[PDB]
């Protein structure tokens, strides 16, 4: 197997913003470890000339989610959002960084 190209570990929100504004495609994303909330993960995605940040939520049963659909791992949440918008008002489908 190959490592995932979307995990960046603990990088500043600003650095994620910086590198993502330079991407050419909508949906370009990365998962980072939140510096504001230790133990939390954040999804940073580019759409248009904008860069948005989503907090990966975890519920009482230990599952991950953004809005309503729950998953068992960050892997599945990410893969599911490659064909389901990550936002309720814009159609942002995750696409690997390039």
């Amino acid at each position: 197997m190959k490592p995932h190209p979307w995990f960046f570990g603990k990088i500043p929100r600003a650095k994620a913003e910086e590198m993502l504004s330079k991407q050419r495609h909508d949906g370009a994303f990365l998962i980072r470890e939140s510096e504001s909330a230790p133990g939390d993960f954040s999804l940073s995605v580019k759409f248009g000339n904008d860069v948005q940040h989503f907090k990966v939520l975890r519920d009482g049963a230990g599952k991950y989610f953004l809005w309503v659909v729950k998953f068992n791992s960050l892997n599945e949440l990410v893969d599911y959002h490659r064909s389901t918008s990550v936002s309720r008002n814009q159609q942002i489908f995750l696409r690997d960084i390039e």
Partner: peptide, 7 residues
């Protein structure tokens, strides 16, 4: 504080 589209 930092803000998130889903929070």
């Amino acid at each position: 504080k930092p803000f998130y589209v889903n929070v």
